[PDB]
């Protein structure tokens with residue numbers, strides 16, 4: 169019933185509202201991205217709260233976990249959309265905001281976009297199924313926490329353990345073949361680990377942009393601006409860190 173729940177709660181299409189009549193400029197692109205980011209955050213919150221066992225977490229931990237993993241979750245899902253929509257050729261942030269190389273450059277996030285596009289390609293190189301994608305995204309929500317722990321660490325550890333086992337099942341079920349399916353699990357865990365460094369570059373870029381937004385003329389929605397100035401700094405200063413499968 170796990171996979172059914174994931175498929176049932178999976179967010180739908182989310183547009184950015186980008187004016188594709190305009191010629192493209194740093195401000196216009198980033199202003200649309202920030203608006204889309206706020207929109208996606210709202211959907212990620214609803215998605216997370218409807219995940220199996222998620223309400224078992226302390227109230228403060230629930231939001232904490234969502235805010236810390238928000239960027240990684242967006243990276244992962246967007247990498248998936250790009251793979252299934254345009255074969256990783258471009259970055260499908262939204263139906264009305266697709267990034268070609270010109271916008272990657274004009275947005276001033278080229279290196280970050282290069283990393284993300286590489287991630288999207290991995291979905292194809294590894295032949296990731298829709299089901300593995302859903303389970304991995306779920307596990308991604310439980311992959312970053314304060315080094316000093318959450319208000320109720322034990323509950324988080326139990327929930328994380330259960331999602332790892334669900335991923336292990338979706339791999340074991342009629343699909344594999346050999347005796348040691350440590351290979352498919354190994355690469356999927358490696359792929360999830362690869363999201364963290366990308367999220368970190370996006371975190372850094374988001375932080376730097378918010379600090380100088382006043383000049384660059386870029387609006388930051390209320391919720392996104394609070395996460396970037398309250399949550400993000402904690403990740404950048406080393407207080408909250410990703411949980412890596414491999415060292």
Ligand SMILES: O=C1[C@@H]2[C@H]3CC[C@H](CC3)[C@@H]2C(=O)N1c1ccc([N+](=O)[O-])c2ccccc12
Nearest residue numbers: 201202204205208242243246261262370374
């Ligand atoms: O939120 C932000 C802005 C904040 C502030 C500056 C930029 C990165 C983070 C801007 C931005 O690009 N984004 C992003 C917006 C929307 C998506 N998405 O749903 O496709 C994103 C997916 C991956 C990475 C970032 C996404």
